Write a protein that binds this DNA or RNA. Sequence first.
RNA 1: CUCGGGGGGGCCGGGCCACCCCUCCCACGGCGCGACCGCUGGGGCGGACUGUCCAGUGCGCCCCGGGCGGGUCGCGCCGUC
Length: 47
Amino acid sequence: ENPVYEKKPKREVKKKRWNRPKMSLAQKKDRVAQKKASFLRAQERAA
RNA sequence: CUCGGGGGGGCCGGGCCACCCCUCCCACGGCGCGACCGCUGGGGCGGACUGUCCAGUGCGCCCCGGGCGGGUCGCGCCGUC
């Protein structure tokens, strides 16, 4: 009788992000520096 | 002027360049300023993340400032057998 499909009407939404974006080069680079400082700092503390 | 023959100056108008002053546009080069593009420390808000010391790193919007680079445009001055 009626096989036509009425598409679901789209509704605008508030911008929401549900997953992390990529870390930048600076963030990745600074992370290694913090890890290096943390390692040496722990070594000095132990001695 | 020289022995009819021979040698010269010419005839009067216009514009132009030299001389002395200003003056329009264009081209090229330089200097300075300005506008916009435009390369690139500080502050505020929001948010995401990192570090085996509380510290640190991007991102979104806004407000400034410096170093000083180029381009487009517009001026002002200088130079050009």
